[PDB]
Design a binder for these strands. Structure first.
Ligand SMILES: O=c1ccn([C@H]2C[C@H](O)[C@@H](COP(=O)(O)NP(=O)(O)OP(=O)(O)O)O2)c(=O)[nH]1
Ligand SMILES: [Cl-]
Ligand SMILES: [Cl-]
Ligand SMILES: [Mg+2]
Ligand code: NA
Ligand code: NA
Length: 307
DNA sequence: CCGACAGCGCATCAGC
DNA sequence: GCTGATGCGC
DNA sequence: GTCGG
């Protein structure tokens, strides 16, 4: 909020690079710069000042100078009024429509949500669902609803087989007051490093909790769910992970992104699967893990895992 | 100067 | 029909 | 776009 003008500018630049220019690394550069500035506890008076922050270089410092002196960015104002670029950028807000699809659509005169509605045959299954729940997917989920959603998931999972273990991770596990989606990690003692995932998904569809499917395989389900009453439709992912790699998965999918990076950087090598020792760099076999604390013993409650 | 910049499952396409 | 590449979300 | 070897 203290430098919201600058961070919004950088975020807008970020999106354009990712969505229109298809330059993912420049997207991430702008985001990294936006993040380090948003955490900066002073009102920025110059680009030179911001330049001192890691992730802010010459080009962004120059842009900040323009923004501070004029209250805007010339090229950013031009991009906003550009029909092609703004349409491409907007279409990517539809889940399933990335930079490639967005560009192709705009190339053939398809630029709006209404245009998408008139051209259903040109959309794949995922994109049709993204279109259908466009507004709902951009809503956040209050913790109270997440709790009700957790109630349903844990209940139905245990009814299928009481030996399943299910954990809602992500921001919810970190105790966030709101969440963007629901991330569920699933395991079963019969699965280590059968159709375990299918049976869970089917039961959730049976009680009319899961309403649509974006993608589904033996280890990962991505779909849509809805609380009964009208509640917005929500995004839910369910991952089946081997029992012996469960808690590494729980750690990884709990977050936050900043905490995860800082944890393995201050670590051994830690990925989503295992933790293995490193010698000349030759990684050994995975270490035995039966809890989150074991990783730390090689502690931070989820409540404080922002960094 | 110049390469890194995370890594994975699934859906779908390109090539054969 | 197949294998591998690409797009996509996250 | 920025960083760092
Ligand atoms: O690009 C990504 C994003 C997330 N992840 C993992 C790490 C993260 O902790 C986990 C949860 O992703 P969310 O984007 O769902 N993080 P959070 O769930 O904590 O934010 P929200 O409440 O917005 O989902 O998925 C990746 O591996 N790659
Ligand atoms: Cl790039
Ligand atoms: Cl591994
Ligand atoms: Mg989440
Ligand atoms: Na800097
Ligand atoms: Na999209």
């Amino acid at each position: 909020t203290l430098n919201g003008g600058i961070t919004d500018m950088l975020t807008e630049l970020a999106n354009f690079e990712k969505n229109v220019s298809q330059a993912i690394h420049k997207y991430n550069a702008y985001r990294k710069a936006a993040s380090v500035i948003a955490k900066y506890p002073h009102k920025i008076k110059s680009g030179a000042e911001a330049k001192k922050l890691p992730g802010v270089g010459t080009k962004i410092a120059e842009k900040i100078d323009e923004f501070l002196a004029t209250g805007k960015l010339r090229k950013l104002e031009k991009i906003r009024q550009d029909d092609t670029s703004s349409s491409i950028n907007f279409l990517t807000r539809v889940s399933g429509i990335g930079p490639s699809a967005a560009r192709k659509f705009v190339d053939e005169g398809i630029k709006t949500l209404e245009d998408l509605r008139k051209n259903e045959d040109k959309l794949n299954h995922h994109q049709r669902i993204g279109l259908k729940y466009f507004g709902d997917f951009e809503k956040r989920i209050p913790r109270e609803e997440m709790l009700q959603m957790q109630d349903i998931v844990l209940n139905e999972v245990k009814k299928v087989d009481s030996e399943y273990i299910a954990t809602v991770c992500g921001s919810f596990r970190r105790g966030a007051e709101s969440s963007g989606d629901m991330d569920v990690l699933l395991t079963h003692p019969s699965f280590t490093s059968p159709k375990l995932l299918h049976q869970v998904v089917e039961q959730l569809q049976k009680v009319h909790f899961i309403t649509d499917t974006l993608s589904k395989g033996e280890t990962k389900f991505m779909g849509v769910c809805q609380l009964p009453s009208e509640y917005p439709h929500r995004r839910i992912d369910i991952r089946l992970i081997p029992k012996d790699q469960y808690y590494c998965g729980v750690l990884y999918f709990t977050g936050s992104d900043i905490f995860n990076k800082n944890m393995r950087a201050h670590a051994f090598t830690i990925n989503k699967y295992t933790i293995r020792p490193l010698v000349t760099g030759v990684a050994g076999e995975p270490l035995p893990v039966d809890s989150e604390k074991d990783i730390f013993d090689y502690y931070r409650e989820p409540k404080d895992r922002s960094e």
